[PDB]
Amino acid sequence: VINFDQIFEGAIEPGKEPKRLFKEVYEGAITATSYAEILLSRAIEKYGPDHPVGYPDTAYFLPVIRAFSGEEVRTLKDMVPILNRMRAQIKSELTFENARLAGEATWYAAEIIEALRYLKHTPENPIVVPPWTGFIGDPVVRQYGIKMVDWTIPGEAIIIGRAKDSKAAKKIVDDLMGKGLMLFLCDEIIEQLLEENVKLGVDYIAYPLGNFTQVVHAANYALRAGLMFGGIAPGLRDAHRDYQRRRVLAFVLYLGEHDMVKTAAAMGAIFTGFPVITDQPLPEDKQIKDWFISEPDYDKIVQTALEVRGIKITSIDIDLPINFGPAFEGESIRKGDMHVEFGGGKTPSFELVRMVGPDEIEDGKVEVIGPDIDSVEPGGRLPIGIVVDIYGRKMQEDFEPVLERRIHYFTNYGEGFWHTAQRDLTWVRISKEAFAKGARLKHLGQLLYAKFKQEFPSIVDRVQVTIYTDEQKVLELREIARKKYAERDARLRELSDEAVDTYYSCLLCQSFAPTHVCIVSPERVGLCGAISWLDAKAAYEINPNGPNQPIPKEGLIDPVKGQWESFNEYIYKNSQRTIERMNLYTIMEYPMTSCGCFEAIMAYLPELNGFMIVNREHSGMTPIGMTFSTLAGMVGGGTQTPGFMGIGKSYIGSRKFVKADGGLARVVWMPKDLKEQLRSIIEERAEEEGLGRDFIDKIADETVGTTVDEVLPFLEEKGHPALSMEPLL
Numbered sequence: 001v002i003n004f005d006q007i008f009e010g011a012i013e014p015g016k017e018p019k020r021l022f023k024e025v026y027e028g029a030i031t032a033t034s035y036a037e038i039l040l041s042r043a044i045e046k047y048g049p050d051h052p053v054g055y056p057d058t059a060y061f062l063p064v065i066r067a068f069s070g071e072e073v074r075t076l077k078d079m080v081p082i083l084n085r086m087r088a089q090i091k092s093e094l095t096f097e098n099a100r101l102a103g104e105a106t107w108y109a110a111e112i113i114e115a116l117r118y119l120k121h122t123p124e125n126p127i128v129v130p131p132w133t134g135f136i137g138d139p140v141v142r143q144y145g146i147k148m149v150d151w152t153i154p155g156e157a158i159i160i161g162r163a164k165d166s167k168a169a170k171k172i173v174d175d176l177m178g179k180g181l182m183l184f185l186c187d188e189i190i191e192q193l194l195e196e197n198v199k200l201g202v203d204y205i206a207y208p209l210g211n212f213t214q215v216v217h218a219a220n221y222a223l224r225a226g227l228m229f230g231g232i233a234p235g236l237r238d239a240h241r242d243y244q245r246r247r248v249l250a251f252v253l254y255l256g257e258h259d260m261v262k263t264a265a266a267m268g269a270i271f272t273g274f275p276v277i278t279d280q281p282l283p284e285d286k287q288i289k290d291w292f293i294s295e296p297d298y299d300k301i302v303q304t305a306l307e308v309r310g311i312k313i314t315s316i317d318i319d320l321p322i323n324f325g326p327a328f329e330g331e332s333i334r335k336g337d338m339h340v341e342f343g344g345g346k347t348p349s350f351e352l353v354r355m356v357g358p359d360e361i362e363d364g365k366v367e368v369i370g371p372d373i374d375s376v377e378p379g380g381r382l383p384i385g386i387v388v389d390i391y392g393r394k395m396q397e398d399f400e401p402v403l404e405r406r407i408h409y410f411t412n413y414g415e416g417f418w419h420t421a422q423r424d425l426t427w428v429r430i431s432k433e434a435f436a437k438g439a440r441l442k443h444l445g446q447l448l449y450a451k452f453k454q455e456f457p458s459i460v461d462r463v464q465v466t467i468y469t470d471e472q473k474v475l476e477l478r479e480i481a482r483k484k485y486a487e488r489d490a491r492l493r494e495l496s497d498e499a500v501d502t503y504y505s506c507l508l509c510q511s512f513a514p515t516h517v518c519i520v521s522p523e524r525v526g527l528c529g530a531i532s533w534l535d536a537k538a539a540y541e542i543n544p545n546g547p548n549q550p551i552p553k554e555g556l557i558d559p560v561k562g563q564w565e566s567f568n569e570y571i572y573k574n575s576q577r578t579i580e581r582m583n584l585y586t587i588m589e590y591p592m593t594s595c596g597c598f599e600a601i602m603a604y605l606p607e608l609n610g611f612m613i614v615n616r617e618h619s620g621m622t623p624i625g626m627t628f629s630t631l632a633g634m635v636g637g638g639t640q641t642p643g644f645m646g647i648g649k650s651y652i653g654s655r656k657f658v659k660a661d662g663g664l665a666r667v668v669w670m671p672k673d674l675k676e677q678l679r680s681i682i683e684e685r686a687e688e689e690g691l692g693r694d695f696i697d698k699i700a701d702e703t704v705g706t707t708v709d710e711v712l713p714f715l716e717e718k719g720h721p722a723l724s725m726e727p728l729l
């Protein structure tokens with residue numbers, strides 16, 4: 001019933017088909033499928049038809065195939081009928097329909113060829129090294145979903161071929177990274193950007209895939225979105241294409257001299273709804289309106305692609321000397337690249353947002369008080385105290401901690417600006433490159449001002465930013481800040497699931513996970529780990545129409561498992577009626593659903609009488625016989641999964657942590673690093689439960705084993721309480 005092809009209806013008037021383009025696509029699709037045919041036959045000769053084949057760290061087999069036709073490719077023989085089908089759908093008649101089918105066959109061919117390449121890939125002997133990615137694992141797709149759902153990443157650019165010259169490559173890519181687009185790069189443009197010292201790699205959301213058929217690692221990335229968050233069944237071809245067209249705002253930049261295989265791959269992009277913009281001149285018989293178009297002027301090609309795709313960018317439009325955007329949030333500034341640092345146990349530091357009255361503030365006044373960063377030798381240090389005063393008619397003291405959180409992100413988005421921690425434990429660094437470009441502390445203050453005004457227009461009327469660098473002045477002001485921090489800690493201490501009468505929904509991820517609803521209570525953070533009850537409450541109070549809504553706690557059904565009719569009704573209504581009940585204190589019956597951005601996954605193991613937990617960053621097998629990525633393929637997508645649940649890491653430290661299932665006492669296995677990340681809260685909560693602070697050492701981890709038979713003897717020897725608790729079944 002989904003007629004996806006309707007989006008093409010007006011594109012080409014009959015009898016004027018661009019036969020030059022369609023012949024090139026046909027030749028390239030024949031070439032790609034032939035490449036795959038011969039490599040596959042040779043591989044079956046060498047290894048045998050039953051040899052396993054696949055990609056590293058994915059739940060979705062060969063994802064392009066798994067999405068569009070649903071096959072669970074596991075061995076070489078499985079790909080033989082699939083490729084035979086794709087070659088069969090490549091047809092000489094020069095229609096737009098046959099061109100799109102040839103592009104789909106080209107994507108299938110490139111995916112097959114790449115899986116064959118990975119037949120030689122092992123961790124000890126890998127076929128790709130950073131900053132190149134090749135196939136991108138599921139955890140990376142998931143780790144960036146939270147930035148996609150609110151269009152912090154506004155769209156995706158697939159750049160194929162070669163820019164006119166190195167300098168043009170750096171120009172457009174710097175532009176795109178400042179706009180926050182996710183980049184996929186293929187062929188000679190990568191070396192062009194590295195030659196120009198552009199930052200690239202998974203940490204900068206700018207993926208150097210490789211060359212040639214590695215282009216398909218853009219496609220199998222994009223299609224996993226619908227398979228993961230969208231919950232769309234494998235093989236629902238038009239449903240997947242519709243999800244891509246509506247939610248994955250990707251386009252292709254086709255740079256350099258054209259070639260048949262690159263053109264056929266680009267037509268596969270068009271086949272799933274992504275337009276193609278090339279820097280090459282195009283004769284009338286080699287173009288399609290709004291789908292395969294020429295913009296030779298490098299000063300316009302980015303805006304042209306964004307307009308044809310429908311991407312609208314919000315910019316602060318302050319003249320900063322450095323680039324700014326999500327790609328730089330993940331950067332590290334090594335000591336040898338550091339021009340100056342503040343805080344981090346080297347010098348005193350704090351940051352503070354505070355409400356003030358109308359008379360108390362000069363809107364827009366950004367002032368540095370003390371020496372600036374040109375006063376130190378490179379590698380030097382200064383104190384820093386950042387005070388952001390805010391006035392507004394709708395400003396509340398409650399909002400102060402919320403706004404203060406943003407300083408971290410606001411700072412880290414600066415290229416060559418870096419920030420970690422919070423309050424009086426901040427550590428800030430500024431790169432030598434940023435200093436060389438003219439960055440000074442005034443620019444940090446201006447960035448904070450503009451960003452606070454842009455993000456909170458309805459509660460911020462005046463903003464003033466003062467940055468202090470005198471050591472004794474910073475130490476004096478830090479005590480005022482610490483008074484505010486203690487008031488905030490006391491307000492937090494007053495909260496509990498029982499003491500508040502209203503929990504809050506979070507629908508932010510419904511952009512990509514339409515049936516999923518999060519419920520945030522004081523003692524259960526949202527599964528992303530970034531939205532606590534105070535956060536959701538402030539977000540609603542700032543924007544009553546937004547994706548966080550109050551829900552009264554009314555109509556109790558089960559005090560023990562945590563079920564109320566008010567939450568049941570809200571979830572059912574906002575679930576497209578897929579979900580009727582939710583228990584807040586158990587994973588074993590009506591668990592809360594997940595999108596796919598969960599920091600960790602819990603699962604029950606009957607053989608161990610207890611829970612395993614595994615975080616997204618952990619690589620390795622778990623005692624349930626599944627890696628994190630496989631478990632995540634089951635747990636996400638907005639379906640209810642008794643015995644499994646997605647969670648935020650900090651929820652493990654909550655007093656209400658799966659309380660009806662036994663809480664922390666029920667946890668028998670976690671990765672060693674995750675326990676270390678949470679060691680203090682695990683020790684404190686275990687003491688509160690009566691488990692002992694050494695309970696953390698009774699929790700098995702991968703150094704104990706990855707299977708039940710390795711783990712159970714250790715649990716028995718340790719006298720883990722879970723073995724003597726009631727089975728949860």
Ligand code: SF4
Nearest residue numbers: 506509518526528531
């Ligand atoms: S609280 Fe839930 S719905 Fe909201 S952003 Fe986090 S994971 Fe997504």
Ligand code: NI
Nearest residue numbers: 595596597598
């Ligand atoms: Ni999610």
Ligand SMILES: [Zn+2]
Nearest residue numbers: 509595596597
């Ligand atoms: Zn999500």
